[PDB]
UniProtKB/Swiss-Prot annotation, chains A, B, C, D, E, F:
Null mutant phenotype: Deletion results in the concomitant loss of motility, mucin adhesion, and the ability to synthesize flagellin.
GO biological process, one term: negative regulation of extracellular matrix assembly
Protein name, entry field: Transcriptional regulator FleQ
Binding locations of 3',3'-c-di-GMP: 42-45, 186-197
Record's comment describing the protein's domains: The N-terminal FleQ domain mediates dimerization and is essential for function.
Subunit details: Forms homodimers. Forms homohexamers that inhibit transcription initiation. Interacts with FleN; this complex is formed in the presence as well as in the absence of c-di-GMP or ATP.
Organism: Pseudomonas aeruginosa (strain ATCC 15692 / DSM 22644 / CIP 104116 / JCM 14847 / LMG 12228 / 1C / PRS 101 / PAO1)
UniProt-annotated binding residues for ADP: V3, G33, T34, G35, K36, E37, V38, R190, R219
Gene behind the chain: fleQ
One annotated Gene Ontology cellular component of this protein: protein-DNA complex
GO MF, one example: cis-regulatory region sequence-specific DNA binding
Activity regulation comment: C-di-GMP interaction leads to active site obstruction, hexameric ring destabilization thus relieving DNA bending and activating gene transcription.
Length: 250, 250, 250, 250, 250, 250
């Protein structure tokens, strides 16, 4: 499901194939919108976990004071609000894949607790004495510079080497503009299959888009396709049908 | 119902027409009082959802600890206070429009949960295992700088590109003062139709109002009309009948 | 479990033997990845505490505002969130070993409270009047320069001399490259025993690795073994099978 | 409990005797490890406060933002975190001795508040209107140059003359090396009484130690005894059994 | 309560009498220990404010970032930490005397805010719109050269002339050594009345003290009396009973 | 309210009349104490802004790091400490007068930002995208040599010509001693009206004062009147009742 001819994307496909059917921890690195969660889900369905659960954890969205409960579960009465006993993300991911979205935003207290769980392959729910087994395949993703964070003392070096066994780097769209035509075909095909609209781009428009910086990378490209299908339904998109900020000629 | 001759408002009318009868997510951007909820309701009644429910969500008014329940519903016993099982805003908006008022005030934990619902088109009530379908057309509104918030890590970039498919910007009143006479006619007509009073403005007063900054935009203008209909019932409003802070001459 | 022929590692083994079965406080000094926690656990299982608990404290991971509770325990209602009364790390380590990971990151307020506990061999839970006994063997570890911190006023000199009774220095991998072949054999044996893969290195690759700086020391070496077992499963690793940054020839 | 024949230590003993059973404020001056807290505790148990509490305050360890609460106590709700009403160090020291460890590290705002309490013999808890009585005997200690700090504006001159009624200076170990044999006997006796080990030093080793600079003074000397009892259990310590940095011959 | 026969102290007494029962701003100038706060309190109890509050402000002790709150009060939520609404020193001094200790250490931002309050006789709490009345009599004190500070731009000239309506200069002890015998009698009487000890000085000791420079002025003299009452309880103090640095003969 | 017969003060009165009811920027130049803020306030109450706010800015008192916030306002979270969104001096001065006290002490970074606001008549709060309108009449004051500062690169020449549209120079008191009797009458009348005292000067004292240099100009003269009303209440002030430094005869 990863479209393109660039050396970068070919490399990524080759690396995914190498690691997918192992249980090795994968760290996917790349700017927002470069397809890291797509890569994680693809890996999962081509792994030994492919018949098991795929469980995301958005490390920087969950309140720091609640993340321990979210990851590890809690027993009734463990804290204010805990009036039921509930399984956490690790328990839910057992026999499957645990996907750690933006691992660089995980608080230090949880970084160390995660590492112990990776080492011991056991955990306790918050408020519980019961040591439970876990068997999860780890996939993590980040757009941050974890090496700098280690230097800054905001990320744990021992966790880093445990997670970063098989790194996969996703190049930004601006470094692989040769794939834009193929990406657009796929985006347009999806839209048409789902009966949400139809457009196509002429070569001048494609040339213009290949000169855009794409701060939001492929997600930004997808957003443009959606928008154009409203502005010019069933239209052929030339340079003049592009929003001004996407027009790059000379 | 959007009055005026300005290029800005003509553009807005043209854009509403382009997107209304699609199910594309609309993001309405503008200062408080610029008519964003008016635009949302107008879109709804000219959409494929026009015979369905229009359900507002005030993202920054709802307590963060209760917003999950409010959006997604809850089962009996899900949390302290949950002694009944209730449908949330998403369930209530099914087959209609979900209007997200000030989306920039939605907490990060809910930003990500919202995004998953947009992606999977399914949700669970709080405390429930039952995966339910949802079919809602999304309209969101903000007076905040979401791009800056992305930079600050207070708003999710993946949610942003999912919501911001068709942006509609509402210019502040101070940037479209040519519409003030027409706006005033409409405001006065509404007041008179509802038997709440009657006034009219002379040209000197209108000139004075066109030099006002209107921090509260059209809502502030409406407030002035109401106030004047009390201070000068059935009166003709000149410069001298305006409150001091609205008097701008020379 | 400490592999190698270097004078350094022989010295370390000799020193561990001298101190393990005493209850003397041990300070282990060394860069990240030099095996300090391995040394601590080894000491524990060869100590008078070997049938007791081994309790880690990650001094720089725990929020400073929560560390007092974490170390000393708390009574119900001691602070916001304390709705149960819980034993801390000191209480949990009674009759065993308390391992202070990165003691240089412990906040000054807790440095002094720790010292009093070392002196008086008693503590109170947060919010409690009850003076409790503690009997723990202390092992601490740091990658920081505690002597400089004393000069800077960021570490307590009285605590330093109390902890630093028996220092054990771990040399960085780059200062003991003669041990790399033996380390690799052990790493590979562990991987194979655990059915996680299999590789072996030829002499040219080993020579190349002996010229690497190893910023992450032995943990970085372990990470490379894991990675290579994916890239070249059941392969013989030569210079060309090493990632570029590990290739050092001429 | 202050061992030695030096003129310095005899003087100190004579001065302690002069002031102990008065309630006069004592300032103990000396490098770290010179026994200032030992002197303070000795004074206390030979004072009119000897049946009362001895309450330490580590002025430079406590967060500046919390020191007011720590010294003076607080009422419920006084600040963020104050969900109980608690007595401070002054209240706890009533009828006894308040020991101010490193008074030179007390923040200026608290220096002045302390002085008012010394003058008025009354205080209020943080957030309270209730004026409470206090009767404490003050003993303070510093390794800093308070006279220079007065010049620098970092210590209050009015507080200085209030605290410095009876100064006691502790000479560094390097200025009283004639006491080292006696100090070592006492240190070794304590270790043996507590069943923690046994050593003794020959005259050559003692001569070598008398040429050491002792940056950590008596605490550093105590640390060496502990360390040697591990390295050479029940051994006789000669020059060769000393760590290299303590070997001083010629 | 101002003892002595010197022309200087007679002048000071005469000037205090002139200004005390007026509400004129008084600036007391003098080295540390010359009795400036004694003079301020004396003025207050012989003023029109004598039944009102005497409220000190230590301008150079209070953190600059907190001084606005300290002087003017704050409303709940005004800043980080403000979870209660509290009256400041000005509000507390209403109907009484506000004593500004070391006014030369007041930050420039607060110098100007103070001046406006002196001019307008009104203030607002931090974070508040409510303009409150204040009626305080101002007494200020400094050991600094305010005229030089004006030249340096570190003190406001407009504030200076507002505060410096009635200056009172306190001579250093070394310029009024004829008062030392009388000062000592008063100091000794206070000590004896408070049952804290008893001494008296012979004429040779008094002659010696009259040749001392007294860097700490009268406070330093008081400190010596306290110290001597410990060293020579109920003793007659001659030249030989004085500490060496106070012995001045020939 | 500007008293005197001198050609200088007559000129100043004539110039104030010329410019007051215009919105032209006024720069008032003069030594400290020459009545520049008096002139600014007088101008304001005789201007088109006379029913609007008069808002002072003390350019050299406000911390340079806070001046941007002070002038322009800030949004919540703009910087450390910004937990509320607040309007700045420009916003507060809208429809009125902004008085820039000692404009020569404004930092260069703010000089340029001020100039842009003068040019564009718009500003943004710190941390905000919202462009706001401002309509303020500018009055500035300085005792510095702005022409020299331009040469030194410490003041902006483009800002200088924008501010210096209508300069008004205030002569020092020593250059208009013919006005001293009239100034004294006014000062004494104010004091008596406010029931703060009463004095009058004989001709010999007035002659003496006319030979004084008055480094603090009229403010220093006012200070003397206040002081004399304490020293000689309801007295007639002759040469002998003047403080020595004001006595100038022969």
């Amino acid at each position: 499901s990863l479209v393109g001819t660039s050396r970068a994307i070919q490399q990524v496909r080759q690396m995914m194939q190498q690691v997918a059917d192992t249980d090795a921890s994968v760290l996917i690195l790349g700017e927002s919108g470069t397809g890291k969660e797509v890569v994680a889900r693809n890996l999962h369905y081509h792994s030994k976990r492919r018949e098991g659960p795929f469980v995301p954890v958005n490390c920087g969205a969950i309140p720091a004071e609640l993340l321990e409960s979210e990851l590890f579960g809690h027993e009734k009465g463990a804290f204010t609000g805990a009036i039921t006993s509930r399984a956490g993300r690790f328990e839910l991911a057992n026999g499957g894949t645990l996907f750690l979205d933006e691992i660089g935003d995980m608080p230090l207290p949880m970084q160390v607790k995660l590492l112990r769980v990776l080492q011991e392959r056991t955990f306790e729910r918050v408020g519980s004495n019961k040591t439970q087994n876990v068997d999860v395949r780890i996939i993590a993703a980040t757009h941050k510079n974890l090496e700098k964070m280690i230097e800054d003392g905001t990320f744990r070096e021992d966790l880093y080497y445990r997670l970063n066994v098989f790194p996969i780097e996703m190049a930004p769209l601006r470094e692989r503009v040769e794939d834009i035509a193929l990406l657009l075909n796929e985006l347009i095909s999806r839209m048409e299959h789902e009966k949400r609209g139809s457009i196509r781009f002429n070569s001048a428009a494609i040339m213009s888009l290949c000169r855009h910086d794409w701060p939001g990378n492929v997600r930004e490209l997808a957003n443009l396709v959606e928008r154009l299908a409203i502005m010019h339904p069933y239209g052929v998109i030339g340079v003049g049908e592009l929003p001004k900020k996407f027009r790059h000629v000379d």
